[PDB]
């Protein structure tokens, strides 16, 4: 049934705006993602404790970004994507250079979510 | 004695040129300095284990830089200074934004060595 999914998005968007009022709409969702961060000093990947549902969102300023509602702690992840060149697809991961030059690695539990979300990110920044 | 410094200055410049041939002259010297580096992401200062005598040098191309002859290991530090704005003085320390965007902290044992060299940096 269709009406459920409009109601699912309505609850989802109300929650996202409760944490981040400037959010305007949900472009796409990924059921579960794990977050990694690359330490430029050790030059190795490290695992963060940020894990949960991934929401691709557009804010009032038309910027593209994603929120991850962490299932392990109240500390969520909200990062904008400013440029196509700053997001790559390598093997099973999304690697993202943030505005502050940090390097994030996204692993999606569903591989089909990885490929769909990465192409919708291309179509959103153009 | 003036003859004393003629051989001391001669040996110092002779040593610097052995590690860094482009070195042309020594502008000033600091007896002992410790080097710190700020870790991005970690948002902390780190101990660099580079410690020793500080040589402010002028380059073959007339560039300004400083060499620190490490007393703990053969790993020296040679960093150029591009602009007075790239070195600030904050609470007895010199903080230097290097060419590669790294930020180093210089600690001098003599504050008169500290501020004296910092005024020499503000020129050139």
């Amino acid at each position: 049934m269709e009406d459920e999914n409009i109601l699912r998005n309505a609850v989802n968007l109300q929650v996202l705006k409760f944490h981040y009022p400037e959010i305007e709409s949900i472009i796409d969702i990924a059921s579960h993602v794990a977050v990694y961060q690359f330490d430029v000093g050790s030059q190795k990947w490290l695992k963060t404790s940020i894990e949960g549902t991934f929401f691709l969102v557009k804010d009032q300023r038309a910027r593209v970004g994603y929120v991850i509602l962490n299932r392990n702690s109240p500390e969520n992840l909200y990062l904008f994507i400013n440029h196509p060149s700053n997001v790559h697809l390598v093997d099973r991961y999304l690697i993202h250079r943030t505005e502050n030059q940090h390097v994030v690695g996204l692993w999606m539990f569903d591989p089909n979510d990885m490929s769909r979300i990465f192409n919708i990110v291309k179509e959103s920044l153009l | 004695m003036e003859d004393e410094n003629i051989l001391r200055n001669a040996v110092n410049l002779q040593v610097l040129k052995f590690h860094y041939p482009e070195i042309e002259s020594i502008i000033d010297i600091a007896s002992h300095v410790a080097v710190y580096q700020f870790d991005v992401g970690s948002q902390k200062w780190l101990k660099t284990s580079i410690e020793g005598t500080f040589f402010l040098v002028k380059d073959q191309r007339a560039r300004v830089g400083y060499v620190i002859l490490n007393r703990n290991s053969p790993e020296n530090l040679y960093l150029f200074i591009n602009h007075p704005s790239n070195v600030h003085l904050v609470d007895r320390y010199l903080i230097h934004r290097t060419e590669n965007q790294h930020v180093v902290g210089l600690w001098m044992f003599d504050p008169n060595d500290m501020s004296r060299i910092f005024n020499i940096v503000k020129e050139s």
Partner: peptide, 22 residues
């Protein structure tokens, strides 16, 4: 359940700054 950080691919060379000392 998520892979260990060890298997993650290396980032683009221009995304990682050079080491502190040449």
């Amino acid at each position: 359940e998520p892979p260990s950080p060890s298997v993650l691919p290396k980032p683009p060379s221009h995304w990682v700054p050079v080491s502190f000392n040449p």
